[PDB]
Paper text:
[name], a core protein of the cyanobacterial circadian clock, consists of an N-terminal CI domain and a C-terminal CII domain, and assembles into a double-ring hexamer upon binding with ATP. [name] rhythmically phosphorylates and dephosphorylates its own two adjacent residues Ser431 and Thr432 at the CII domain with a period of ∼24 h through assembly and disassembly with the other clock proteins, KaiA and/or KaiB. When co-incubated with KaiA and KaiB, [name] exhibits circadian phosphorylation cycle as follows: ST → SpT → pSpT → pST → ST, where S, T, pS and pT represent S431, T432, phosphorylated S431 and phosphorylated T432, respectively.
In this study, we focused on an inner-radius side of the CII ring in [name] as the research target based on our recent observation of [name] crystal structures, in which an upstream region of the phosphorylation sites (T416-H429) at the inner-radius side undergoes a structural change. The F419W substitution had little impact on the overall structure of [name] as evidenced by backbone RMSD of 0.42 Å between KaiCF419W and KaiCWT. Crystal structure of KaiCF419W-ST revealed that the indole ring of W419 was oriented toward the helical structure on the neighboring protomer. This suggests that the phospho-dependent variation of W419 fluorescence reflects the environmental change associated with the helix–coil transition. Although an interpretation of fluorescence from tryptophan in proteins is a challenging issue, one of the potential quenchers of W419 fluorescence on the basis of crystal structures of [name] is a sulfur atom of M420. The side chain of W419 (or F419) is far from M420 in the ST state where the helical structure is formed, whereas they are in close proximity each other in the pSpT and pST states, in which the upstream region adopts the coil structure.
Author numbering:
A (entry chain A), C (entry chain A): 18 to 108, 123 to 248, 257 to 497
B (entry chain B): 18 to 108, 123 to 249, 256 to 497
The structure:
Amino acid sequence: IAKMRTMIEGFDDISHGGLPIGRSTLVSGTSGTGKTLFSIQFLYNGIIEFDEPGVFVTFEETPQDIIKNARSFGWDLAKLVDEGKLFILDALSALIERINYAIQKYRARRVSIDSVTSVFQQYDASSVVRRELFRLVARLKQIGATTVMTTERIEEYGPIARYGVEEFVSDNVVILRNVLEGERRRRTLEILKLRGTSHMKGEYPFTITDHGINIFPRSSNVRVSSGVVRLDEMCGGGFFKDSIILATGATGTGKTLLVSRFVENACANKERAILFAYEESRAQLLRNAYSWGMDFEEMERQNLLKIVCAYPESAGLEDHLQIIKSEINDFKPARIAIDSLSALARGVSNNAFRQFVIGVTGYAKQEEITGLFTNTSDQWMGAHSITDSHISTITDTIILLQYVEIRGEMSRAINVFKMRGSWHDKAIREFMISDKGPDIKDSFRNFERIISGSPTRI
Amino acid sequence: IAKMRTMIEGFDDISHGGLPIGRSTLVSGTSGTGKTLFSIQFLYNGIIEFDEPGVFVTFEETPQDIIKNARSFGWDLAKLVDEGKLFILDALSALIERINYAIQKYRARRVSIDSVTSVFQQYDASSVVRRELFRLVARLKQIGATTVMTTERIEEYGPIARYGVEEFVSDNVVILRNVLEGERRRRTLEILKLRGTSHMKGEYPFTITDHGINIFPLQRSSNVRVSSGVVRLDEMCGGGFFKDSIILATGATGTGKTLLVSRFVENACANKERAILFAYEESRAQLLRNAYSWGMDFEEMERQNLLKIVCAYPESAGLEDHLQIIKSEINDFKPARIAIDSLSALARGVSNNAFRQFVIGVTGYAKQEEITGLFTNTSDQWMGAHSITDSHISTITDTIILLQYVEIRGEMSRAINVFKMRGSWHDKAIREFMISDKGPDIKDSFRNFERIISGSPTRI
Amino acid sequence: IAKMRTMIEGFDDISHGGLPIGRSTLVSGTSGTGKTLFSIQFLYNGIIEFDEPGVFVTFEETPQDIIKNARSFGWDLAKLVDEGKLFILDALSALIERINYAIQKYRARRVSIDSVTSVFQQYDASSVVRRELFRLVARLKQIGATTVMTTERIEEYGPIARYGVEEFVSDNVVILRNVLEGERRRRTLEILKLRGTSHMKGEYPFTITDHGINIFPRSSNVRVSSGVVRLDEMCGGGFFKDSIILATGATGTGKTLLVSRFVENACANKERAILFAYEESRAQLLRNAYSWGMDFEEMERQNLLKIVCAYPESAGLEDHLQIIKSEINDFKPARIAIDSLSALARGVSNNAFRQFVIGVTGYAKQEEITGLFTNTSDQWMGAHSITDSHISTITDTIILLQYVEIRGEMSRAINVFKMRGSWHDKAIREFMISDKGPDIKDSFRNFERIISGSPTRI
Ligand SMILES: Nc1ncnc2c1ncn2[C@@H]1O[C@H](COP(=O)(O)OP(=O)(O)OP(=O)(O)O)[C@@H](O)[C@H]1O
Ligand SMILES: Nc1ncnc2c1ncn2[C@@H]1O[C@H](COP(=O)(O)OP(=O)(O)OP(=O)(O)O)[C@@H](O)[C@H]1O
Ligand SMILES: Nc1ncnc2c1ncn2[C@@H]1O[C@H](COP(=O)(O)OP(=O)(O)OP(=O)(O)O)[C@@H](O)[C@H]1O
Ligand SMILES: Nc1ncnc2c1ncn2[C@@H]1O[C@H](COP(=O)(O)OP(=O)(O)OP(=O)(O)O)[C@@H](O)[C@H]1O
Ligand SMILES: Nc1ncnc2c1ncn2[C@@H]1O[C@H](COP(=O)(O)OP(=O)(O)OP(=O)(O)O)[C@@H](O)[C@H]1O
Ligand SMILES: Nc1ncnc2c1ncn2[C@@H]1O[C@H](COP(=O)(O)OP(=O)(O)OP(=O)(O)O)[C@@H](O)[C@H]1O
Ligand SMILES: [Mg+2]
Ligand SMILES: [Mg+2]
Ligand SMILES: [Mg+2]
Ligand SMILES: [Mg+2]
Ligand SMILES: [Mg+2]
Ligand SMILES: [Mg+2]
């Protein structure tokens, strides 16, 4: 069974090539899931890429509203209709002939019907829909062209369609969802079945942007600096270019301090760096940075640093990934920083969060970008948190900052927890922050049980 | 697709400009969600901000009741009668004509219909509803005017409309909710879809006030330092706190959080500065006594119109309501610094999602108006450090003042330490402090003591 | 919009004045929720207070049963009907006229219809109810008098009414619930909406008594004694008159011993004290008390002590509050004692329990009553329990009793954990119980980690 490329970032890989050619695919989903955007994008790409004439049979919506609505993604369907590339037919076998005729009249290969559930209210009786639904499908496959039928849904986790019979008639079934968990929406796509072919099972996180749908389905020995010389000595000559570093520690340990020095070092070597803030504001970050002896304002003036401040609770994880990607695709940094991951995990699912980290890490490694992500531990024992963290198994380097109470004084300690394919210092060296940055000193030799955060004289 | 500024506090940002031009927006919700209120506000602002002629089509309620109902928000009906900028049509295509007629009879632009679910009593079939709903939105778009059709729902988490078909006919869908979790209602508005445009997905906390709906959508940083009330505490923070900064004092029950809040507010009024104290644990009567027992006359500071106390039981109103109160109270008095006693009193019997959205708002607004916020929180463990790390609101704060009990020689002594100070140097020593009739007396730290963070140290 | 006072303890504050005048309020709820009791109480109060003639339109019930049923709250509707103050009309616009006529014939201002859901079985068809329901409402508001319509419900957390359309017709909606959680009923009232006015949102705990419905929506420096001189020295001269004391400790620490001495001290100063027991029985309490050297039997003979023994598992929290209040309103004590709160929290919700403590504390402070509540900790570390307790943040004084194992002997220790707006001793003094009460001795000076319950020689 040949598959027809839809040129939809993700769907191509999820459908193992695309949609079965000569057959009809059903895209069911609730209101605002993006059933019309998909059907349009399936046609547009078809004419904008392989130049394969395509017809869109409208119903509840008009040929003007569709074009005007398609303008949101910067598309000109009028020019596509002015060149006879696309045909929008306004709207019981009078339609089947009109489509069969129009298709042959414009030598069409890709058709989209949005929606059939609209023109079935006068029928109902469940079995009535089926018989009329089956006839259409047969009248399509007989013509020999591939389509993507649109169907309405009531529940996100209920019947496939409205009459729960359209799925058994259609050859391929794609379900568009928009689940609401914790007052936060999430668009997920899934291929229920693909008769006479293979596909990726389960749901995949997607978003809607000006580009349209965005379904989200080497190892060089080159070392880079972190901004701190002592830390580079502890990492056996700084981090790797194509590596993921992780700074985990208690609140106010110095995660943001290390990120500031990591971003500065990029801009100091005339290299672009993107800082994704989710805890502090640009105003505060600029002040805090300057207090340590770093002019972030200057770094933005040299077009070598871009601060992307935003609230984690605002947008969803799926959207946050689309932002970093787009922002990374535009500025094209040498190294990025996420401050922090703990701010993006609160009020989120462990499953939906794991997929975020995989994407950011994978993309960062795919574009050969040195990513330094931070994370605030939920326990006073940093080691316990790092071991309890499922994102710590994915990171290549782990910088652990731990509070150590010594002589009734809350001192701080830093240690390179792990360093993949590179020697690192295994000593828990103490450090003190000043008006110039970190000052990594010696490691507590005459103390025991320092991992608890409260050592004892040996 | 041109938008239409509804002038609704929040919706403008949530809708990325407002509602699509010459398009039909559906506002579904249960009874008491505020569909009619929203519908009135939409038109009201239209002919009181941009002079936009709009008509309100009624069905269940009459032109007098509606006009009388808007009297709770101080809105007169002189715009619909004397002025003639409004039009209340008392109440299948017999009405559509009148809508268009009146529209062109005042060069219309904004329309509001409440409710369209009530004009389908005769018809019980969903198919019929769609057909009539479809032709309505069709004509409307043909005329070219911003319509805000209002429908009703049965479940807060179920069908979009009563017949679950109106959402597919309408171009835009807005769902007003009023969820009840733990015998407490929560009004949340959400934009389901906006055909041919972008918007904020998911539901946003809103409240209904005398000004109507109050939707709450989700470089300064000066180095100017302010005093906390305690001299030694200012020396421990490297010259007092920051002006536009959030401070948090966590500790076991009876550690001295309220004592620190009392000096923070006193110091304000001492420099002829206004300070609002938000109480949620003790009452004014009690607070005045304890305050005076520490050597502070809060009654005096209230007499100088410099201090205000807003006592209220947490377990009564919703977090969104508390947020609306603080804002309004801060917008009225306009203080230099505020105090919340406490965040733990407002966290009990609330969701971590709903509670984190609160602190973000208060912190955000406090910093957005350059107000020094001293928030407190009673720790649920005897190891204060554990609780601070466990706290997902401890990362949000700029300064953290940790108070913790320390058993020494079979005596329950207390210790204070500046856990962290964002973009500032602070003392890293756990100095013991005592409380008396003059207030806190920060002493020295414990040199020959180990495992002090445990609450029960050992002689070194 | 003017509001009409219903003289219902609570509703006045929950409705911010009362019910919208010239409009109709809908009181929906299940069977036994108290829809008829409310409607009657709305009329009675109207004639017994502002003397505003009122008419009750009955249906399934008769004008005799209603009066006989109203006798339970000690009301004489016959005398109200014998004076032409109330009119009970026995029982499709023949009724609207009968009401419109009768109302004007008796110059009525308050009307009650129980129930409309009864006279709608022959109609049904959902939309039919609406049209007939809307007509009634319009025929009422036109007359210009305020009402409280009664409607039946199926589920406690489901449709507002039976046809789920009455809520959209009515101007104001009040829902009476009777939720069953853990084989225990709880009556909650709520104002869904109030068109053209403000109200308290969410549900409020209410009960039914002989008084009818019972919706439940200074700081002097005067010090009082606890019965123990050493404890008064540790509290800087005893507790405050308008203060809440809390005795938290492990089972058999001496909570009941301290409560006995606290109640005795009241009766010793010719002051009335109420002891609310929930763990031990009067028989046992009398014996235990006498064993320490206190004649509680004598204290009851002097009309200075009243023991209110009851089982927590019997009645609900809402009811327990109504008892203390009524019992406090009758005897009018100087100081009360709850033994204990831990007995009233088992098999209850943390939310429904927090509201109980607020009420008892608030009322105790409103009537200037010194309340000493006890609580049995669920851990061996008293400090951990006090910190973990959400009721410990509301109490003004916290007396912590902790078991301390010394020299293979289970000794006991007492300490004033906190004392609001008063100096207190910060020493963990040991104590031993004898045949005369508590003997607070010195504090363990040569021991460390005593808070664990198992110290160590220093
Ligand atoms: N340019 C854009 N930028 C951002 N978001 C957009 C943009 N255009 C559309 N959207 C979002 O994506 C959605 C796409 O709606 P679409 O018309 O595809 O809905 P549908 O699934 O066909 O629904 P219906 O059942 O009403 O036909 C919009 O409702 C909006 O939330
Ligand atoms: N100018 C300064 N001089 C000395 N120490 C400073 C200075 N500025 C900040 N610090 C120290 O740095 C700490 C904050 O570091 P940073 O904000 O990087 O920590 P973090 O762990 O990233 O914080 P958060 O918990 O907010 O994410 C402060 O608590 C303080 O102890
Ligand atoms: N001044 C006010 N202060 C506080 N709350 C108010 C005020 N005015 C109105 N409200 C609240 O807002 C509600 C307004 O009801 P509204 O008419 O907006 O409801 P609706 O969603 O249109 O209901 P319906 O199902 O009858 O159409 C009141 O019930 C009340 O809860
Ligand atoms: N006049 C006083 N003299 C001495 N100590 C006092 C005096 N007033 C209060 N205290 C001390 O202060 C404690 C209460 O301080 P404060 O109320 O500020 O603490 P908190 O942490 O806010 O407690 P809560 O858990 O009640 O909110 C008392 O337990 C006592 O130790
Ligand atoms: N004097 C009383 N003392 C205690 N409880 C009482 C007393 N009188 C009534 N009750 C309780 O309150 C309830 C009040 O019943 P009421 O007649 O108000 O029911 P209703 O909600 O109108 O129900 P229905 O749907 O049957 O009309 C009684 O069923 C009983 O449980
Ligand atoms: N006559 C007595 N002489 C000495 N000790 C006594 C005497 N009577 C009781 N006790 C001590 O008092 C303890 C009980 O005290 P009390 O009943 O007040 O404790 P409690 O903590 O309130 O109990 P509960 O856990 O049942 O609530 C007994 O375990 C015993 O050790
Ligand atoms: Mg569509
Ligand atoms: Mg940080
Ligand atoms: Mg309405
Ligand atoms: Mg306090
Ligand atoms: Mg009844
Ligand atoms: Mg006892």
